[PDB]
């Protein structure tokens, strides 16, 4: 679902669209970003959420590496991209890229 539209204050769900077994998360880095403003990082099990989204961000690995933002705000409208990288021998290889756009009606 490239385009998702939710009303203000509702629950926003964005699916990275890729399923990764819990076994390989150590050899995987997952980045959710929004127009080159980092949102969430899962570097080899070490997580990190930026201040703009630390309070209202839930990351679900099982559900297609999806994220949930509660209490949608008018300034959160934009395009979000999910990138998954696998640690191959002496390199980090991008194994999936997904782009999703969220619009807020007010």
């Amino acid at each position: 679902v490239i385009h998702v539209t939710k009303e203000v204050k509702e629950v926003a769900t964005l699916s990275c669209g890729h399923n990764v077994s819990v076994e390989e998360l150590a050899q995987t880095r997952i980045y959710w970003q929004k127009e080159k403003k980092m949102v969430l990082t899962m570097m080899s099990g070490d997580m990190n959420i930026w201040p703009e989204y630390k309070n209202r961000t839930i990351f679900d690995i099982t559900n297609n590496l999806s994220i949930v933002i509660l209490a949608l705000r008018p300034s959160d409208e934009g395009t979000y991209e999910c990138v998954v990288l696998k640690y191959e021998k002496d390199a980090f290889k991008r194994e999936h890229l997904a782009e999703v756009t969220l619009s807020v009606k007010a």
């Binding site: 490239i2 880095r29 980045y31 080159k36 990082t41 990138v83 990288l85 191959e88 002496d90 390199a91 980090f92 290889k93 991008r94 194994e95 999936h96 890229l97 997904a98 782009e99």
Partner: protein, 203 residues
């Protein structure tokens, strides 16, 4: 006697360009700014294979598209911050809507020269319907990013005066390949509007 589209004949000056792909290479030696006349390019459409070789800024880039009706017509190079090199590639029009396998070979010629440091296959991230055979000869590259059929990128910058320029607008034709050799994130992105580009010289 059934109709089928075919590639346009060769010429000397192609006035119709298509934004085929965008390549950003990050290097661990110093490149300062764009230099006029630095880049030199050669091209060949043999069989249904298209091949471009570019020399400049201490790198040789050999890019091939496999089983294609396109032909390479132009390339431009530019340099941005943090030793980033951007290569814009322009082919003839795209006839069929099918992803093609790519082969990229990057060789270092001025700094950190060596033998084959990397050789692998990169899946197409968005659709997983193609692949890029990446080969790197040297210890000079830190990241490679390949965008086939760019959409967001605006190739009009210094739009050449006498030519026509076309760009993809569908999200289903996008393709994104990439590898990063550094512990940090890929960070192989760079803004197009902050790069000063120069057309490569055919020879």
């Amino acid at each position: 006697a059934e109709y089928k589209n075919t590639i346009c004949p060769p010429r000397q000056d192609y006035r119709y360009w298509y934004f085929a792909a965008e390549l950003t290479i990050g290097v661990n030696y110093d490149i300062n700014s764009t230099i006029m006349g630095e880049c030199h390019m050669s091209e060949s459409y043999i069989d249904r294979n298209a091949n471009i070789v570019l020399t400049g800024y201490g790198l040789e880039i050999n890019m091939t598209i496999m089983d294609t009706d396109q032909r390479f017509v132009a390339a431009a190079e530019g340099v941005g911050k943090d030793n980033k090199l951007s290569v814009l590639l322009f082919t003839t029009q795209r006839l069929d809507k099918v992803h093609h396998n790519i082969s990229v070979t990057i060789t270092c010629m001025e700094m950190n020269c060596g033998t084959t440091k990397y050789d692998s296959d990169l899946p197409e991230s968005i659709h997983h319907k193609s692949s890029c055979d990446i080969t790197i000869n040297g210890s000079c590259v830190t990241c490679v990013n390949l965008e086939t059929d760019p959409t967001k990128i605006n190739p009009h910058y210094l739009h050449p005066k006498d030519k026509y320029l076309y760009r993809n607008s569908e999200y289903g034709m996008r393709g994104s390949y990439g590898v990063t050799f550094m512990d940090e994130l890929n960070q192989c992105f760079l803004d197009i509007k902050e790069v000063s580009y120069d057309i490569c010289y055919r020879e």
